[PDB]
Ligand SMILES: Nc1ncnc2c1ncn2[C@@H]1O[C@@H]2COP(=O)(O)O[C@H]3[C@@H](O)[C@H](n4cnc5c(N)ncnc54)O[C@@H]3COP(=O)(O)O[C@H]2[C@H]1O
């Protein structure tokens with residue numbers, strides 16, 4: 001109960017701040033859907049390329065799954081930074 | 093004309109790849125709007141806090157504009173990483 | 185009141201989870217003190233180097249204040265990532 | 277012997293600079309201990325959740341081990357940036 | 369054909385801009401070669417250390433392959449940021 | 461004298477390791493030159509665009525100097541990560 005008063009640096013948030021944070025998180029959910037769609041595209045591309053040595057090698061060299069994971073991480077940490085800008089903890 | 097054939101590692105993109113890239117960029121435009129709204133909130137909060145020494149000091153210590161800039165950069169580079177996952181350049 | 189139930193993805197935390205999060209934040213406070221000490225060192229070094237053109241140029245070329253700001257940002261975002269590992273939001 | 281004179285951009289460090297660098301590295305060791313404790317917590321949580329399909333799925337969706345690895349990397353690179361602010365190499 | 373006119377924010381590039389972008393990408397290829405050489409060094413070091421428990425443990429604790437992967441990612445995203453500085457998209 | 465024996469986690473480096481580190485740093489110097497050339501291009505572009513309101517606004521919106529600074533930071537930290545992969549400190 002009222003666990004935020006127990007966590008260092010956290011403060012009481014207004015309804016406006018909570019609403020802005022939730023807007024960030026909902027836009028993030030949309031990005032999650034998009035990233036899942038891209039991952040499905042990559043799976044289908046790899047499948048359609050089976051036993052095409054040159055195209056499989058091209059895909060492997062491009063490393064698209066690693067780049068998608070990098071992008072997902074960046075989107076999530078950007079979300080966290082914006083939410084911190086809104087919520088403004090009282091601590092380092 | 094056909095400048096992509098002149099840039100190292102770039103390749104001919106299908107309509108599906110272009111569409112996915114544009115989906116990423118349009119979601120990014122939505123994030124740009126959200127970030128502008130948060131920046132307006134920060135400006136209004138700072139203005140309403142003028143000549144309240146303690147609250148101005150709290151805002152300054154929280155560094156919300158710096159955190160918003162960090163978040164914007166992360167969102168943009170995440171977008172670029174996802175677009176790279178889609179477009180798959182042929183070079184390092 | 186009970187604002188965490190209003191924020192997307194947040195959940196009820198056990199006392200153990202709150203304690204671990206606060207441990208992260210207290211270690212972060214120690215890092216804040218260290219970073220302040222380094223900044224004081226940089227200020228004193230620059231002051232003691234006044235009207236020594238070569239040493240002022242060396243300091244300017246090394247960009248130590250920019251590197252200290254990069255380090256501070258990395259420590260803070262690492263803290264946030266560890267706290268996310270502990271608290272485990274239910275959302276993207 | 278005196279290998280720093282062989283590495284581009286490195287310089288002779290004062291005792292004060294070495295002491296500050298070691299302070300950064302010792303605080304980092306404390307963070308290493310904390311991260312190990314969090315990893316042990318995650319292992320125990322996963323073990324206690326065996327054959328609870330919903331809770332295992334929740335943990336998997338939260339990706340806590342990946343977030344702990346991200347946090348560890350950020351702490352380490354922040355340390356390196358602060359140490360660079362102290363030591364100030366003479367090169368890009 | 370002329371696919372850049374179909375992608376949001378992209379613009380017509382001058383020959384000078386294309387040349388600068390390709391300079392970035394060629395320097396990046398040189399970094400790719402260097403990273404491959406370091407990876408070969410790591411493989412040879414690990415091989416020469418087989419059945420030397422202490423040295424294998426030292427290598428494992430240092431995590432050199434993970435640090436090489438972090439460095440590769442940073443070089444690639446730095447390249448992308450410089451290329452963005454040159455090409456200057458019209459969108460977020 | 462022999463300052464590396466005083467810094468936590470540092471070790472004695474072979475000539476081969478020092479050579480690889482210096483190769484990384486020299487490639488980095490080449491990147492420094494390239495980044496300076498891009499910055500000169502940006503200055504000249506801005507100058508040639510004086511009193512062209514639309515083009516000045518386009519440049520300002522693209523934020524090319526900020527993207528060049530992001531790229532420089534990424535290249536430098538990637539260098540540091542590769543050098544860490546080579547040198548392999550004994551500490552966190
Ligand atoms: N046809 C293609 N084939 C293969 N891969 C492709 C491709 N088009 C794009 N990519 C990949 O997508 C990456 C990210 O593109 P983004 O548009 O997000 O980020 C781009 C964009 O902001 C900018 N840029 C590139 N071309 C541009 C143009 N014609 N006009 C304006 N900005 C441009 O430069 C940024 C970095 O470009 P970079 O090449 O380093 O990184 C590119 C490249 O790896």
Ligand SMILES: Nc1ncnc2c1ncn2[C@@H]1O[C@@H]2COP(=O)(O)O[C@H]3[C@@H](O)[C@H](n4cnc5c(N)ncnc54)O[C@@H]3COP(=O)(O)O[C@H]2[C@H]1O
Pocket residue numbers: 004009010011012013079080081083084087088089090188193194195196197263264265267268271272273274
């Ligand atoms: N009431 C408040 N007052 C002041 N500042 C506030 C605040 N609530 C959040 N913040 C700030 O927002 C940052 C990012 O929150 P986010 O939810 O994106 O990222 C959060 C979230 O993913 C997770 N988290 C925190 N509490 C949680 C909970 N109850 N349930 C689940 N996950 C939680 O931990 C992440 C990192 O938290 P961290 O504290 O390091 O970083 C927080 C903190 O600096």
Ligand SMILES: Nc1ncnc2c1ncn2[C@@H]1O[C@@H]2COP(=O)(O)O[C@H]3[C@@H](O)[C@H](n4cnc5c(N)ncnc54)O[C@@H]3COP(=O)(O)O[C@H]2[C@H]1O
Pocket residue numbers: 280285286287288289355356357359360363364365366464469470471472473539540541543544547548549550
């Ligand atoms: N004597 C000196 N003069 C001027 N600047 C100095 C310096 N000693 C260190 N620095 C600066 O500090 C940066 C970070 O050092 P750190 O020990 O955190 O991170 C180091 C450390 O993990 C590793 N490393 C360097 N020398 C090592 C050694 N002898 N043994 C083990 N690891 C070593 O390589 C990492 C990256 O090194 P990098 O040179 O790229 O980046 C170095 C360099 O810019």
